[PDB]
Amino acid sequence: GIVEQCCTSICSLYQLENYCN
Amino acid sequence: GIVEQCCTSICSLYQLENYCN
Amino acid sequence: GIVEQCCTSICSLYQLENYCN
Amino acid sequence: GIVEQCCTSICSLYQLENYCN
Amino acid sequence: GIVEQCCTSICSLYQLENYCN
Amino acid sequence: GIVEQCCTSICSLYQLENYCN
Amino acid sequence: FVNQHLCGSHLVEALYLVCGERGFFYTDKT
Amino acid sequence: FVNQHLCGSHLVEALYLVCGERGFFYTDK
Amino acid sequence: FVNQHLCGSHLVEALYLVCGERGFFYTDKT
Amino acid sequence: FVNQHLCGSHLVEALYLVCGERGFFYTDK
Amino acid sequence: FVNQHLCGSHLVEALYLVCGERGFFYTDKT
Amino acid sequence: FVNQHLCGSHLVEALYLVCGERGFFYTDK
Numbered sequence: 601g602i603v604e605q606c607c608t609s610i611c612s613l614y615q616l617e618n619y620c621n
Numbered sequence: 622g623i624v625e626q627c628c629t630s631i632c633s634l635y636q637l638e639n640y641c642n
Numbered sequence: 643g644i645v646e647q648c649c650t651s652i653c654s655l656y657q658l659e660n661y662c663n
Numbered sequence: 664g665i666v667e668q669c670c671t672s673i674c675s676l677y678q679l680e681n682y683c684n
Numbered sequence: 685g686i687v688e689q690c691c692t693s694i695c696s697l698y699q700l701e702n703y704c705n
Numbered sequence: 706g707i708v709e710q711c712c713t714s715i716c717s718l719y720q721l722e723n724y725c726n
Numbered sequence: 727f728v729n730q731h732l733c734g735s736h737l738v739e740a741l742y743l744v745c746g747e748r749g750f751f752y753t754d755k756t
Numbered sequence: 757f758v759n760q761h762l763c764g765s766h767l768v769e770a771l772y773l774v775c776g777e778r779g780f781f782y783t784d785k
Numbered sequence: 786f787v788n789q790h791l792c793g794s795h796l797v798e799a800l801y802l803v804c805g806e807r808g809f810f811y812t813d814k815t
Numbered sequence: 816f817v818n819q820h821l822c823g824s825h826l827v828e829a830l831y832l833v834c835g836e837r838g839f840f841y842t843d844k
Numbered sequence: 845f846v847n848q849h850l851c852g853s854h855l856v857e858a859l860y861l862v863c864g865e866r867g868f869f870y871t872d873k874t
Numbered sequence: 875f876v877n878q879h880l881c882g883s884h885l886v887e888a889l890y891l892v893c894g895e896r897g898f899f900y901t902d903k
């Protein structure tokens with residue numbers, strides 16, 4: 601999920617917005 | 622609201638955990 | 643000013659990117 | 664101390680409280 | 685107080701180092 | 706630059722001040 | 727623990743450490 | 757277990773800027 | 786995105802993520 | 816020497832939330 | 845250096861970098 | 875690519891305390 605995906609490679613704001621709401 | 626209980630008024634620890642999963 | 647547009651007044655995203663290189 | 668102990672493994676709030684006062 | 689010298693009033697760098705070990 | 710230099714070894718405030726203005 | 731208003735990223739951050747492994751839910755304003 | 761715990765620190769904070777008012781859940785596992 | 790005043794390190798931080806690889810310029814007050 | 820220096824960043828900040836008014840010392844060595 | 849009020853984690857953080865290897869003491873309010 | 879991206883987080887923030895009003899550029903490459 602977010603952590604595997606964003607703590608390995610840099611999530612941009614756009615990718616991060618995916619995990620809202 | 623966590624915001625309305627811990628930003629507009631001060632919050633205790635307990636009071637914070639209310640908002641854990 | 644970024645400060646005068648995003649601290650003294652609220653800023654949108656767009657409005658922020660104005661200040662990228 | 665705190666750094667060996669908390670920068671290797673995750674200190675919870677509780678463990679961290681140990682290094683107060 | 686660091687708080688009363690650097691939060692209630694502005695602090696210089698020097699003024700901050702007063703509070704190093 | 707700053708990142709090679711400060712993300713490998715600890716830049717002190719003094720070293721960091723170098724990349725101002 | 728702090729007797730202070732936690733107002734933003736600080737709110738989140740706080741939650742982050744208060745909750746830990748449990749995890750959390752941030753609604754923002756309501 | 758820090759480097760995912762120190763990482764997350766940042767994620768929650770950035771999920772805050774980006775999610776604005778919609779909110780988020782932070783959980784896994 | 787936040788409908789909020791971004792006032793300090795938060796300003797910078799924001800820029801940091803908004804801009805990313807592009808990079809940024811912080812003048813502070815003007 | 817960052818990854819303990821970037822780590823500490825977080826520790827001091829979290830020692831701030833938890834220690835409230837009692838205060839802390841941050842030192843080692 | 846900033847001509848600003850440093851008010852919280854920011855206070856601490858600041859100290860953290862101002863002091864560095866030396867280290868520091870945070871009493872909070874007094 | 876985080877550990878330079880999480881590092882930078884800190885650098886920009888500390889470049890803010892130290893550079894006060896003069897300002898900085900943050901870029902490379």
Ligand SMILES: Cc1cccc(O)c1
Nearest residue numbers: 606609610611766770
């Ligand atoms: C903004 C951010 C922080 C940490 C990791 C990431 O992938 C993205």
Ligand SMILES: Cc1cccc(O)c1
Nearest residue numbers: 669672673674825829
């Ligand atoms: C809260 C926190 C931050 C960094 C490391 C830890 O072990 C705990």
Ligand SMILES: Cc1cccc(O)c1
Nearest residue numbers: 711714715716884888
């Ligand atoms: C203040 C700071 C943060 C991160 C890396 C450094 O070298 C210095």
Ligand SMILES: Cc1cccc(O)c1
Nearest residue numbers: 603747749783784785
């Ligand atoms: C990635 C992860 C797992 C479990 C709890 C959390 O808060 C985060």
Ligand SMILES: Cc1cccc(O)c1
Nearest residue numbers: 666842843844865867
């Ligand atoms: C762990 C450590 C050693 C020496 C000074 C410090 O501020 C922290």
Ligand SMILES: Cc1cccc(O)c1
Nearest residue numbers: 708806808901902903
């Ligand atoms: C080090 C680096 C390269 C390119 C863009 C940046 O914001 C930072």
Ligand SMILES: [Cl-]
Nearest residue numbers: 733734792793
């Ligand atoms: Cl603030």
Ligand SMILES: [Cl-]
Nearest residue numbers: 762821880881
């Ligand atoms: Cl980090």
Ligand SMILES: [Zn+2]
Nearest residue numbers: 734736795854
């Ligand atoms: Zn703040």
Ligand SMILES: [Zn+2]
Nearest residue numbers: 762821880883
């Ligand atoms: Zn970090």
